[PDB]
Amino acid sequence: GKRALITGIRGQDGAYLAKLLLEKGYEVYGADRRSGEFASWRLKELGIENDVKIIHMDLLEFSNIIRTIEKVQPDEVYNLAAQSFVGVSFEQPILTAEVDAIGVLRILEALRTVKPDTKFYQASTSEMFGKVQEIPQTEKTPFYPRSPYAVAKLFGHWITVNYREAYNMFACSGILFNHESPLRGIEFVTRKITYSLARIKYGLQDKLVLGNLNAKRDWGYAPEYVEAMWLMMQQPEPDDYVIATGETHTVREFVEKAAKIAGFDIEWVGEGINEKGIDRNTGKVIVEVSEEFFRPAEVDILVGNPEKAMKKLGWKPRTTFDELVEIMMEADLKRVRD
Amino acid sequence: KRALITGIRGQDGAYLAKLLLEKGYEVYGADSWRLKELGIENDVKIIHMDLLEFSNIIRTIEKVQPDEVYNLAAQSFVGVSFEQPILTAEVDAIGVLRILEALRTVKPDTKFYQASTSEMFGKVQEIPQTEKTPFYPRSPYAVAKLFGHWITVNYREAYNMFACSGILFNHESPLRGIEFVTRKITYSLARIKYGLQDKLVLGNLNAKRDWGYAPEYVEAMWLMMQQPEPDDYVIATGETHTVREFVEKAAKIAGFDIEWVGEGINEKGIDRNTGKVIVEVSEEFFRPDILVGNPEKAMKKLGWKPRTTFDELVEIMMEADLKRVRDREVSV
Amino acid sequence: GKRALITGIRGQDGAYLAKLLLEKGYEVYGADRRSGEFASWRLKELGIENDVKIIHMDLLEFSNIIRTIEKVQPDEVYNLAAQSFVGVSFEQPILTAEVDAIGVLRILEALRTVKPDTKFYQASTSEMFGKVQEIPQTEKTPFYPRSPYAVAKLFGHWITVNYREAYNMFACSGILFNHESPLRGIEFVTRKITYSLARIKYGLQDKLVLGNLNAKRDWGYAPEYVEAMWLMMQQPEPDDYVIATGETHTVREFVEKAAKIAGFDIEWVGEGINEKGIDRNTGKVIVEVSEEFFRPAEVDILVGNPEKAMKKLGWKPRTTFDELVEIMMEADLKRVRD
Amino acid sequence: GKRALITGIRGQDGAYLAKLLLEKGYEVYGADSWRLKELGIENDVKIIHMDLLEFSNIIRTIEKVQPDEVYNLAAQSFVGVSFEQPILTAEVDAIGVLRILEALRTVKPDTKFYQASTSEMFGKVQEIPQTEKTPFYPRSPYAVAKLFGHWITVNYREAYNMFACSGILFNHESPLRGIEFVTRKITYSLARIKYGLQDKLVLGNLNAKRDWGYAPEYVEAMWLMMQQPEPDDYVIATGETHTVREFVEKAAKIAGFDIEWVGEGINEKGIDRNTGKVIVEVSEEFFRPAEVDILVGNPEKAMKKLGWKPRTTFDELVEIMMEADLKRVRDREVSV
Numbered sequence A, C: 001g002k003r004a005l006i007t008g009i010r011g012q013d014g015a016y017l018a019k020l021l022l023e024k025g026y027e028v029y030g031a032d033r034r035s036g037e038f039a040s041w042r043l044k045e046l047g048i049e050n051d052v053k054i055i056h057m058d059l060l061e062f063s064n065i066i067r068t069i070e071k072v073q074p075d076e077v078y079n080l081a082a083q084s085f086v087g088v089s090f091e092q093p094i095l096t097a098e099v100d101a102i103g104v105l106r107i108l109e110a111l112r113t114v115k116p117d118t119k120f121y122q123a124s125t126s127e128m129f130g131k132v133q134e135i136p137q138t139e140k141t142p143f144y145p146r147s148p149y150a151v152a153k154l155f156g157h158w159i160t161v162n163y164r165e166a167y168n169m170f171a172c173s174g175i176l177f178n179h180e181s182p183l184r185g186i187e188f189v190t191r192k193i194t195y196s197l198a199r200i201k202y203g204l205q206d207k208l209v210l211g212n213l214n215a216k217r218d219w220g221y222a223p224e225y226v227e228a229m230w231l232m233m234q235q236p237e238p239d240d241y242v243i244a245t246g247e248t249h250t251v252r253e254f255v256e257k258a259a260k261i262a263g264f265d266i267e268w269v270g271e272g273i274n275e276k277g278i279d280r281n282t283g284k285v286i287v288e289v290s291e292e293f294f295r296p297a298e299v300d301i302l303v304g305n306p307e308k309a310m311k312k313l314g315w316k317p318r319t320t321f322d323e324l325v326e327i328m329m330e331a332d333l334k335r336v337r338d
Numbered sequence B: 001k002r003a004l005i006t007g008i009r010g011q012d013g014a015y016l017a018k019l020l021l022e023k024g025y026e027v028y029g030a031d032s033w034r035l036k037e038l039g040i041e042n043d044v045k046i047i048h049m050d051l052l053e054f055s056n057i058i059r060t061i062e063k064v065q066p067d068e069v070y071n072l073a074a075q076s077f078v079g080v081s082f083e084q085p086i087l088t089a090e091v092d093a094i095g096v097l098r099i100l101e102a103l104r105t106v107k108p109d110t111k112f113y114q115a116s117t118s119e120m121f122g123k124v125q126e127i128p129q130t131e132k133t134p135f136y137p138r139s140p141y142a143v144a145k146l147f148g149h150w151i152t153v154n155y156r157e158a159y160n161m162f163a164c165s166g167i168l169f170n171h172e173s174p175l176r177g178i179e180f181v182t183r184k185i186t187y188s189l190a191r192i193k194y195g196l197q198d199k200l201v202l203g204n205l206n207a208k209r210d211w212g213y214a215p216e217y218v219e220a221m222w223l224m225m226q227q228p229e230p231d232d233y234v235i236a237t238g239e240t241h242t243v244r245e246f247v248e249k250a251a252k253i254a255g256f257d258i259e260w261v262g263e264g265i266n267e268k269g270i271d272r273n274t275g276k277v278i279v280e281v282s283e284e285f286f287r288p289d290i291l292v293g294n295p296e297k298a299m300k301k302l303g304w305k306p307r308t309t310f311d312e313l314v315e316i317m318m319e320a321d322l323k324r325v326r327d328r329e330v331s332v
Numbered sequence D: 001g002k003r004a005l006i007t008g009i010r011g012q013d014g015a016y017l018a019k020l021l022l023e024k025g026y027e028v029y030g031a032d033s034w035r036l037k038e039l040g041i042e043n044d045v046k047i048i049h050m051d052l053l054e055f056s057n058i059i060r061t062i063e064k065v066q067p068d069e070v071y072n073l074a075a076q077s078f079v080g081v082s083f084e085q086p087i088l089t090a091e092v093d094a095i096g097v098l099r100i101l102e103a104l105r106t107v108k109p110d111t112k113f114y115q116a117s118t119s120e121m122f123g124k125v126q127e128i129p130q131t132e133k134t135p136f137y138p139r140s141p142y143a144v145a146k147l148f149g150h151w152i153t154v155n156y157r158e159a160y161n162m163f164a165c166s167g168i169l170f171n172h173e174s175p176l177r178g179i180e181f182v183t184r185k186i187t188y189s190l191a192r193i194k195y196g197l198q199d200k201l202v203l204g205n206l207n208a209k210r211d212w213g214y215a216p217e218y219v220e221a222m223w224l225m226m227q228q229p230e231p232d233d234y235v236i237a238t239g240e241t242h243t244v245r246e247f248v249e250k251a252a253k254i255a256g257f258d259i260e261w262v263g264e265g266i267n268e269k270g271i272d273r274n275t276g277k278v279i280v281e282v283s284e285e286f287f288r289p290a291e292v293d294i295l296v297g298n299p300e301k302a303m304k305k306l307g308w309k310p311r312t313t314f315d316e317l318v319e320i321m322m323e324a325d326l327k328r329v330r331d332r333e334v335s336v
Ligand SMILES: NC(=O)C1=CN([C@@H]2O[C@H](COP(=O)(O)OP(=O)(O)OC[C@H]3O[C@@H](n4cnc5c(N)ncnc54)[C@H](OP(=O)(O)O)[C@@H]3O)[C@@H](O)[C@H]2O)C=CC1
Pocket: A007, A008, A009, A010, A011, A012, A013, A014, A031, A032, A033, A034, A035, A057, A058, A059, A060, A079, A080, A081, A082, A083, A084, A099, A123, A124, A125, A126, A176, A177, A178, A179, A180, A185, C033, C035
């Protein structure tokens, strides 16, 4: 059937998207920087590791990209590959830009000269809003990036927009708010929390060390968000969509709710760098704060309004935040048991 | 104090070099008819630097130890940016970050100016445009410059570096490149005056622009850099003129009295003095979004405002090209 | 004690090296591009995942490298990070050179400016000998690289030599021949073979598809090879050393021997692209040959002579090819059995 | 009319090669000059933007030009600079080569490619004389980067059957040679001493041995390599060394000096037999002890397979350079 090429195929979103596209009767081709016996762990969990054709394509290598497009002749390209860690982007800003900004343009150029009727999805992000200029944020909210990651992703957004407008290419920018699942990488706050709490329960770790507990995020369920990616690519005309839950919670709340499911009754004492999460049952400190996990420039709050995606795509979130936290904690408890 | 200027060979690099030398700076230019024209070619120290590669930038910074860096170097053509978007991004976006990251690594106390542009506003989201107007870039050039603007902001905010982004609207001078419409107009009219050319071919004469005088804009760049705290400013006149107005005013200096006949692609300019049809509109250039800056913040905070008027600007450019064309293409 | 910085810390050699250095009383710091919950799988197997401090350092980011040397202040640096896949190097030659050639020079420049008395080890390779000019190959054998990987590594070798000679820096180039272990990545032929056979035995996989079965390699045991890295770094003078077993076998032999341990009795039928490995017991095809796994320019044979390393370092190979095959096959049988 | 793309068009070799190719009816594109102006070809060469530091602009350039032949002569070519800027040197002299090869592979793999390699790759010479089969031993980041250039070109040839040649050229000189080089220093300085503008020529070890050829003949070897049925690599050299002393003395004779050499090593001096004045001396700033590493190329393979050999003798070479510099100093630094 339709051929899809998914960059970042072995990431959270690449895996769920591949599963969805396989169900829709696609041939799925994927490129990723993750190699080795455990790289396809996410595809293995979904039972699709035999059904995806992995090819070598690096966002930094224009000629490799050109060849890949020439060889695959994709009907749809989902650019999900990125250096996606915000904290690391301050340490490696140039590499971050080359992958997250210029790599988008390398794909667009390869498509323009090799197969211009190809549909293109760019994995944009609520991180682009940074120091939010409106609350809630919509497609019309002015951007204010606060990390090299966010600045590079903003280039990726605007270059996608420009190829759509200037070349009449079918190019969509998905402005997705934080979305999570049991496949979320442990580098990220939500999975860091559940993975750590599970290990703390089974005595494999002493404490959970975090940065900014006051940070507020709109957190959704990734399987639903990749559905949104597919849906916008099926519209007769290309456009950009905010995909979000419309609901915001602190990192603190995530920890409390997760920890409850893990059997800890958290109380907070102290303030700022000195704040601690204590299991009320035992008086033990479970959660601590370290300046190491704070970003040089922080993003205090994100909350999206996905009204446009409801009206044009019929997309709406289904999984509640409380459901999300359970899903994640339960999966990680099981993992640490096994 | 030592200043390092990228794009030293351009309109703005040359005028800025002039101004800084007058202020007693040692001036280093990263790599000139413009510097010769200004008589400063032996007063500027030229050094190699390439925005395409990182290690040479580090070395340049270590060698020069600049107090101020002005990043004026750019692939600055919009049409070229559609043909070569990646090269454009490497120079106009990543090259900015390369300089910032070099300063961060070896000389973080250095002041940094980024040469941003009203092209970042693109499909304008407010009229007039201020520092708070949302951006809407419409070319790979404008997209790359937007990255340059935001990355400068981020280095300021993340590291408390002295990093300023100047959002400059169109500025012109006798040193303006012939590639640009203002020079095209003044240069063509002088050639027409001396019978070396028959007509000037242009786009939509209704098109509006905020045109200032380049030497006053490089002054705003320096002023931004002398403030106690770094910030970003819109630098502009805050008034638009049509291409038609520019042409008429330039024509008058050349001895023409233009009567306009027709509309849109049909519009032509006929000299009342001779009856010659000297201006025409082309399908090539004709296009059926008012870019105009509100520079009040620059006035309030820097005490900067335009001094040279539009009429004066046009006169300055016309008198220079009338003289150039005389000297180069007309018998004594 | 002494501080060591190991790039590529989560790969086979980085893992084993970290273990050795910890046993020698070092503080061990590591940078690696592999992240997430299964990135430290090798360090987890060796029981050292809590004794290694992982820092972010990418060989593509000069300023990140500089900052890392500044923070760590290492006494010894082992540059084990690489795009180390030969087949992929033909598809991504520039990225390969940027990591494997220029990355070496980036580290050396950082050391020269931050901490010039740091001892430096470069992970060079028998692959540099390519179309071999002498047999066996020694430190004095003229190079003849046959892939962009090998050309890049050759630059890495010569730039290390040059920094030693021109700056009197303690810089060593280890010319290590192929070395393997149960921690070897599945992208490489040996582990591909053992991993695939275990899965075939258990009906997780149908066939093992390989390329050039005629290729001859000198295959050693990785733990013994990282010992040699440390040994060269402890010598009065810096120098370069071939580390090898001196014994050469075909890929075909590797397959035969591994399959036997797994319970297959392999018969080879056909020739070239049509050659197939049949289980004499069942008549089923276990092994087949695909054009896709052949390299554009091949390395027909590598075999080293490590007599300088014996004479100068007291280093000798202890584990035989036959022992290595058993070690690898046994671990992969166990893994699939769980 | 075949199309040639030359990188490093502004150099000694770029200019002479452009001249030769035009003479052979090529359309010549130079990637970006007093040298081109001197040759009278400044208006016959199409100058285009290309930068070896970045990949996408190379691809576009190849697509636009559609060259039949690419000659990569662009380099950061200074050894001293290479120690100061080793990374930039490698980006231009190593990775830049791969960028061009990878661009041809992607959009025009039938294009012939010449890589400008160098005797500096031999460095600490592993044989004397050196041939295509002599093992390399680079001794600077310039030489290490150039070594990458050579081998990546070999690999593209072998891996993809691309027409890719690496010319291992020993020192070659001409009136177009830059002043930073000892041959021009000698000839330029001696022309200035003749006309009273300078007192002395100050050098290093006069016993220093070099293989010096005539640049136009060397670019001819480049073209010849590219015209063979099969691509291959060649040492292009004279096969004979002369001393710095021999260069100076022959040069001096052309300038009107009759040089007697008095002393040894750092204390050696050139004295004019006619006046008794010290014309030449050796300084500690330039002096290096006896060189064990004699760079001298055996070009027998080039003769056997290309029919290439040097035609301009050493004496002819020195004369050519000295006559050009005498004329230049007369035209520009002394009154009529
Ligand atoms: N998850 C979220 O809540 C949101 C994420 N985003 C974006 O969504 C996308 C996917 O998210 P997620 O699944 O969490 O990301 P992951 O980090 O889990 O996956 C990204 C993948 O990209 C690969 N990659 C990195 N660099 C390159 C490159 N040079 N060439 C090819 N592949 C490369 C990585 O490989 P390797 O593991 O080897 O490094 C990794 O597998 C990313 O673009 C991210 O920035 C945007 C909005 C919300």
